[PDB]
Ligand binder design. Structure first.
Ligand SMILES: *[C@@H]1O[C@H](CO)[C@@H](O)[C@H](O)[C@H]1NC(C)=O
Length: 97
């Protein structure tokens, strides 16, 4: 079951989220525990780099903050549930097999 999966996230799990989180990324950032101030910093600091880079930076900051113990398949699954991205949750289930 995806929500109890304790596997540490690596590129293979993160890549579908990097590619598809898309323009509606900030609500998922809040569910991943970023404050509005932190979201604003990412939004401003990576404006010239583009939306995909804002997404990349947000996800990587989360993986770095939570570490190997905390940045897991099951925790990402819960975040995707909480931010209502069942499309992304489905891609995560498939890549985790
Ligand atoms: C926390 O998230 C809520 C939405 O759930 C938002 O209204 C509020 O502004 C956020 N606060 C901060 C400090 O990010």
């Amino acid at each position: 079951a995806i929500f109890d999966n304790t596997t540490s996230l690596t590129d293979k799990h993160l890549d579908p989220i990097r590619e598809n989180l898309g323009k509606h990324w900030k609500n998922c950032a809040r569910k991943l525990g970023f404050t509005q101030s932190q979201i604003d910093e990412i939004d401003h600091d990576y404006e010239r780099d583009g939306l995909k880079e804002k997404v990349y930076q947000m996800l990587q900051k989360w993986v770095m903050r939570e570490g190997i113990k905390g940045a897991t398949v099951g925790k990402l699954a819960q975040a995707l549930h909480q931010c209502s991205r069942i499309d992304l949750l489905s891609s995560l289930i498939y890549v985790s097999q």
